[PDB]
Amino acid sequence: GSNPPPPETSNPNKPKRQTNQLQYLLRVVLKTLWKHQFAWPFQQPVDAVKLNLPDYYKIIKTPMDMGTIKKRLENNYYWNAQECIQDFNTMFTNCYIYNKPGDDIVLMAEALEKLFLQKINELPTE
Ligand SMILES: CNc1cc2onc(C)c2cc1NS(=O)(=O)c1cc(Br)ccc1OC
Ligand code: NA
Description:
Layout: H1 20-35, H2 56-59, H3 66-74, H4 81-98, H5 104-121
Bound molecules: the ligand CNc1cc2onc(C)c2cc1NS(=O)(=O)c1cc(Br)ccc1OC and sodium ion (NA).
The site of sodium ion has 4 residues, from helix 4.
């Protein structure tokens, strides 16, 4: 097992901008998920070598983590909040795909996902 390159956090070929919604996603949504007790497995790309997970990138082809999401928001990688929201969902979904119902990591992802959904219920309109 080697690790694949991490997801891009910059791209000259990809339209990007700042929005009010994206700023909230960084300052309020991301920051509250990042500081939760259960953030730690999701703060960086999965290191399948150091975690001894040789099948991780056999199963998961569109990997995502909050480290990547944070650097994207900070770099203004996104065109809109929906793209950023989709990266969160990919993150959660990957966890639920690779693992099983009730697994410790799954229960952590579910808890972060609940909090995420709450927080983005307060997302401004443009
Ligand atoms: C079962 N190991 C893991 C599965 C994972 O799915 N998505 C991620 C991210 C992820 C990370 C691990 N490895 S781990 O962080 O050391 C880990 C976390 C938790 Br909660 C419980 C068990 C773990 O490793 C046995
Ligand atoms: Na699964």
